Amino acid sequence: PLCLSQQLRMKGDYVLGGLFPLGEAEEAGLRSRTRPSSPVCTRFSSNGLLWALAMKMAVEEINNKSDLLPGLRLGYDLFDTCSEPVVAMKPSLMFLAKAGSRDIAAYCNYTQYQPRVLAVIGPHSSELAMVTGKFFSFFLMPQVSYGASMELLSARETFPSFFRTVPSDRVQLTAAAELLQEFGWNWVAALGSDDEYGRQGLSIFSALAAARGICIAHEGLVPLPRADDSRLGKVQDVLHQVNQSSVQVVLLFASVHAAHALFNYSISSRLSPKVWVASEAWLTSDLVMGLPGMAQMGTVLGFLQRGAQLHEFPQYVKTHLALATDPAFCSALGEREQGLEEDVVGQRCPQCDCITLQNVSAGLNHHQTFSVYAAVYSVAQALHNTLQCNASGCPAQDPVKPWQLLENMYNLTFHVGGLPLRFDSSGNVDMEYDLKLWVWQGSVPRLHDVGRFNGSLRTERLKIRWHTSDNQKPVSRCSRQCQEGQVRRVKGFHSCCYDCVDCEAGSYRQNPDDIACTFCGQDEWSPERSTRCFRRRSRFLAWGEPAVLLLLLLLSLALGLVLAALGLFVHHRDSPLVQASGGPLACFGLVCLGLVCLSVLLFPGQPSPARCLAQQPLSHLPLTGCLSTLFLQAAEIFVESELPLSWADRLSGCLRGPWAWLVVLLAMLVEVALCTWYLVAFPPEVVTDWHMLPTEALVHCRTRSWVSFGLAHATNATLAFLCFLGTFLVRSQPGCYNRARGLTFAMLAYFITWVSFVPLLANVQVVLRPAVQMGALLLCVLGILAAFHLPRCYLLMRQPGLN
């Protein structure tokens, strides 16, 4: 049976203390507490015994060493913690009982107290760290922990005797926050283990987010794998938030198990890859390195502790185990340690000690051993200084009390394996870190250095692959101090940062603070990103519109030609040809052209609803009268063309006099009648639309139905068509220009114009709709003269000349 428990104590002169997990308490006693007895920890652990052997190596080194603690040897009180305060507190109470006794007094003062150990090599588990440190603080016994990292343990008002190595979670969290700051990663969602480790780290990182500037997005926790299994569901929700927050960087301060569950689910759910700012609890553990498919989950990168490994340790461990096999040395040390506390140590059984060298020869190069080793040297040096010892001996006047160390352990400088470590006021040494990546090449994530951390980061982004494409660094930024114009929706778990949205067209912002693009009335005009509503300008059928000006010029031309023709008609009254072209009925027609000018001229300018009512009907009126004159002429010509003889004579007699003017005035009456009718049915009115175009308010003569106007025009148009049928059939006069053909060009062109501009009018835009309408009448009336009266003038100013 391997000789271990016998070696788990030594006499020395100023005995140290150890609180290590040389075992693992079975998961029954912890739940079954009905009798006051600590659970046994038969189950063996490897790293715990490695740490105990490291403490032993350090103590043997200092004892063997001459210049450090000359003449004074240090012992042990190796006691198990079993990673459980219930079973780890009895050894702690033992450490502070009395010199060579088993009773711990409760005197108000601790100055007169003389405990058994001089210091404690604090536990690993940080729950144990807190419980045992609370116990030790009052008695002021220097407790140096080798694995504790929770930041509260540095609170030197309730833990004044904690002197842990392995810097706290604070330092790695500051490194992570600094990395985010220098990589421009304001918008970060930080997760955490449900256990106290994760929550503590998350609180520290919230403080660091406030300080450095990065704005937290989602501050949740990832439940540990538990029998409830609702944990898994909860994870999804937490994971879902990471998807929803749109974050390419996530801080995972989870323990190894929590991160394992998180990443297993992330693979199983096909979660979008993102940067995973890791922690020392999972950044290298194989339980998260083995998961299939993990390589496709963004870049895992995190800060890992840097510190010389305790070399020449494997040889010592192998030699010590082998010598523990040797009966002679075991019996010798048993005889040396007789009747003393060599048995009360943990795992004191035979079998509890009977193991195989392979039972522990796995994590032989474990980074924690150094910490344990360092711890001993610390107290060694501390003791070496509190006795005021020097090279080659020292007076050692009186047994130094632990509070003497407490006084003379802060700001201590000790060299461990050539590393000059030094505690600070908070009691935690400051060791540097290195940014380990998780670069994948063959599904075996290799971790490599990017930059170091001496309290200030020294990264170099070039090395990180950054997954994605073209090794582009994932940008996860938050709109902070953004353009004032946009509306600002506050987001983030804290009020930090906000989303800025460009306002829409037609909606303005009352004040910068408000969080809505207010919508104002159509009277104003608001473009994109305008916190104000801008008044428009009126748009109408102004007299000054270029098209309106052209139409006015055309109306002036029409008036001129009408006046010329009617002057020729007032003069050439006796000439039979002028009369045969229509007589004073054609005088009515020419003045009707002038009057249709006087009628159509109401469109341009500022339109009034009354103008819309009274304009178009009186517009059709004079043109209707003149075209009725045209119809008289055409029907008379048609009747002449026909050959009934008696009917032709009767119609000529009837139509020469009374019927001509009677029909003219009847056409006038019909025009005004249908005008009143449509005005009752669909009277157009002036209306304003502000949404038709953004920057202007379109005030124009809206029409209830252009069909009504079409029919009002179609009255005279149908008269035109009737005369067109009457006149078109006429064959050219033998050896003379035909009279019917003048009327034929006239009405045929009139249709070609109005039948044509009704669709052109419909197609064109609303405000120019009256504009081209102007032209219609102009062109329309022009047509008549360009195809009815032009030959009449031609003759009149050439009739005397020809003969």
Partner: protein
């Protein structure tokens, strides 16, 4: 005031001061109040004879000093009278000087003491600690508790929040473990209960003795300005009152009027904060405390006048705040009093006393733990029994903070039953609203009917309201989150979460325009029938025959079809009537126009063009060149019809009428406009070519007069086609089909009563033109 001898003592750990010597710390009235509560409990237990005849109980209190003096108390406990505590593996044989300790109030100090006590398995009833860790028993076997956990407090808080409909909250939690733990608990409680935190941010600690350090000053300025910027006006705060004093001072200086501050136990009820009496201007303050039947005779006990075991001026502060304590009616005193009574009942059952005489058996601590884990007894009409996780069913209670000094500084609003996990009996609660209403606190106003809600920000509470467009209706019935389309005839408009209906419109027989055109077509068909009857009646004449002879009837015969088709235009535009109107009506129209066109073609040719190509036209007439030509025209139209069918959809389209959705034009074809243009452009071309040829041959024959009829027909059809074009270009939404029927009749009459009718007109008016000799002379000339 700190000790009493006895047989079985009861250790106590009351926190007397806050913020070895510990009377230098700020005195806490509540500490001495709770001390006196436990003193009253033990005194009443000893006075009684039923509870424990004889077997005198004993007590002893050692100040814990909040967090400072925790270890020394317990170590003095569980130690022999000489103050030596041996270390043993098995403690079942240890006689601890105190059977069970009470007092640890702060959760952290409670854990600190409970670790050692679990070592010795000493019963420990914590009278006010709240953290949910103590619920766990693997960590703390002996940590019984007589105040509900923090989870119950948070559930009461969230149920109050729901009852007043505040889904938009803010959380402020101090930096200490208490604040972070309570904040996480509230976050997990509300993430599931429809309530979304506006933002949870940490509140830095500010001790009353602290000099309000700068960094903290601007940090708190940030806190308060973020608070008032936001829209959530229910601010739940988890922090010790010590920091709340400074926080409330600074925020009050900051003009943050509208706010409903929810308080946690830690400071839900406390004389220090109540005495400020200047918070009426910050709104309403709510908190949660624990309610129980008042101790019948404890105030009279109150008014009566180891390291740091004693206190200096606790009684002076208690006398100063006695008015508040009596009016406020301290209730944690019931917690500790019931804890002492539960320990007494456990000691009573364990001793197995027969209600008259007790056997003073030497009692071990763990034995009392086992016996106390199941006590089940009445106490002032409140049942005391511990659940398997170490907690009692003690009614919580919502406390409204009433400033008025009249009476009852703390007001009971809502009562929360833990066994039922429900908060009810919410009495009337006055607020800071000017109308005594329920203050609003919501992220976004609920969208009115007809608009979808699309989320804004990470939180699922609030959204932008958007009136989902016409044809889409807010599907609040199934999914209120996203609006859904409303297909088929159902049609919605802006807003209007309920759709409307679309009515398909086709050509009927009732519309006045429809009736008028139908009468017009009936008159035309009667005229056609009369023309046919006269033509058949006078086939002997060369006017009837030269129009086509028997073949002329065919035109008329085919003409009949169009009139028969005229109503076929009316009726549903289903596949059947559609195919009819698309296949045969064009057949008639085309043959009718083209036969007359060919008639004119050959008349003018025999007049003018035939002389140009005599041999060619003769060989053409050999097989009836004219009949050949319009036969080819019939063939070409058949080609057009089949091609249009191949490249065009027979089935109708219910195209929405732009005037209004309720009317939807059932057009017989998806693009019957351009399809009709493609079908009728050939008709227009043939008609215009025939008119041009007639105009070339305008020398109309005396008895044939072909021009005087054909030219009329062709010109008037050309004008009609242009009129149809103009009407389309205007595109009068409704009535397109009826006007199209008008036009179909229009060109039908064009041909019929523009060519054939005059033949009968001249036949009946005068028969001389029908004279064969005159006809032959006219042909020659």
């Amino acid at each position: 005031d700190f000790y009493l001898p006895g047989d079985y003592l009861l250790g106590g750990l009351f926190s007397l001061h806050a913020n070895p010597m510990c009377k230098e710390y700020e005195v806490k009235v509540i500490g001495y109040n709770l001390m006196q509560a436990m003193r009253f409990a033990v005194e009443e237990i000893n006075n009684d004879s039923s509870l424990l005849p004889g077997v005198l109980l004993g007590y002893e209190i050692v100040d814990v000093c909040y967090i400072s003096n925790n270890v020394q108390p317990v170590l003095y406990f569980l130690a022999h009278e000489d103050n030596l505590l041996p270390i043993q593996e098995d403690y079942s044989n240890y006689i601890s000087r105190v059977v069970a300790v009470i007092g640890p109030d702060n959760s952290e100090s409670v854990m600190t003491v409970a670790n050692f006590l679990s070592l010795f398995l000493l019963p420990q009833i914590t009278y006010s600690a709240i953290s949910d860790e103590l619920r766990d028993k693997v960590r703390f076997p002996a940590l019984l508790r007589t105040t509900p956990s923090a989870d119950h407090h948070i559930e009461a808080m969230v149920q109050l929040m729901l009852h007043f409909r505040w889904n938009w909250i803010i959380v402020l939690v101090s930096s200490d473990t208490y604040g972070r733990d309570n904040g996480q608990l509230l976050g997990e409680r509300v993430a599931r209960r429809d309530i979304c935190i506006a933002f949870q941010e940490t509140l830095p600690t500010l001790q009353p003795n602290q000099n309000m350090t700068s960094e903290e000053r601007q940090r708190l300025v940030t806190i308060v300005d973020k608070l008032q910027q936001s829209t959530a006006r229910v601010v739940v705060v988890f922090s010790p009152d010590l920091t709340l004093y400074h926080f409330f001072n600074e925020v009050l200086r900051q003009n943050f009027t509208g706010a409903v501050w929810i308080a946690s136990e830690s400071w839900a009820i406390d004389p220090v904060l109540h005495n400020l009496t200047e918070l009426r201007h910050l709104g309403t303050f709510l908190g949660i405390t624990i309610q129980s039947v008042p101790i019948p005779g404890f105030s009279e006990f109150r008014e009566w006048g180891t390291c740091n075991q004693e206190c200096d001026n606790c009684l002076n502060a208690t006398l100063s705040f006695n008015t508040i304590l009596r009016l406020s009616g301290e209730r944690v005193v019931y917690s500790v009093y019931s804890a002492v009574y539960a320990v007494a009942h456990a000691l009573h059952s364990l001793l197995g006393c027969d209600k008259s005489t007790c056997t003073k058996r030497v009692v071990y601590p763990w034995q009392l733990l086992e016996e106390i884990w199941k006590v089940n007894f009445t106490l002032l009409d409140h049942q005391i029994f511990f659940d398997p996780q170490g907690d009692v069913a003690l009614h919580l209670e919502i406390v409204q903070w009433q400033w008025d000094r009249s009476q009852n500084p703390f007001q009971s609003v809502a009562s929360y039953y833990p066994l039922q996990r429900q908060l009810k009996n919410i009495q009337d609660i006055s607020w800071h609203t000017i109308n005594n209403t329920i203050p609003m606190s919501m992220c976004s106003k609920r969208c009115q009917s007809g608009q979808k809600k699309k989320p804004v920000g990470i939180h699922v509470c609030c959204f932008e309201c958007i009136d989902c467009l016409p044809g889409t209706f807010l599907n609040h019935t199934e999914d209120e989150y996203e609006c859904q389309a409303c297909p088929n005839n159902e049609w919605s408009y802006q807003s209007e979460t309920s759709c409307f209906k679309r009515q398909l419109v086709f050509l009927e027989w009732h519309e006045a325009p429809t009736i008028a055109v139908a009468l017009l077509a009936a008159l035309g068909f009667l005229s056609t029938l009369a023309i046919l009857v006269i033509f058949w009646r006078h086939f002997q004449t060369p006017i009837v025959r030269s129009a086509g002879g028997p073949m002329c009837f065919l035109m008329l015969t085919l003409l009949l079809v169009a009139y028969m088709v005229v109503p076929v235009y009316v009726g549903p535009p289903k596949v059947s009537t559609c195919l009819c109107r698309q296949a045969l009506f064009p057949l008639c129209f085309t043959i009718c126009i083209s036969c007359i066109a060919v008639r004119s073609f050959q008349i003018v040719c025999a007049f003018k063009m035939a002389s140009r190509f005599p041999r060619a036209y003769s060989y053409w007439v050999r097989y009836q060149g004219p009949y050949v030509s319009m036969a080819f025209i019939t063939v070409l139209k058949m080609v057009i019809v089949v091609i249009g069918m191949l490249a065009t959809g027979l089935s109708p389209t219910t195209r929405t009428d732009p005037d209004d959705p309720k009317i939807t034009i059932v057009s017989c074809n998806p693009n019957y406009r351009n399809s009709l243009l493609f079908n009728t452009s050939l008709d227009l071309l043939l008609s215009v070519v025939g008119f041009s040829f007639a105009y070339m041959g305008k020398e109309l024959p005396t008895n044939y007069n072909e021009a005087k009829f054909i030219t009329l027909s062709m010109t008037f059809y050309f004008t009609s086609s242009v009129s149809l074009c103009t009407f389309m270009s205007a595109y009068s939404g409704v009535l397109v089909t009826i006007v199209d029927l008008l036009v179909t009749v229009l060109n039908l009459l064009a041909i019929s009563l523009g060519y054939f009718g005059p033949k009968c007109y001249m036949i009946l008016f005068y028969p001389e033109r029908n004279t064969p000799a005159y006809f032959n002379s006219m042909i020659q000339g």
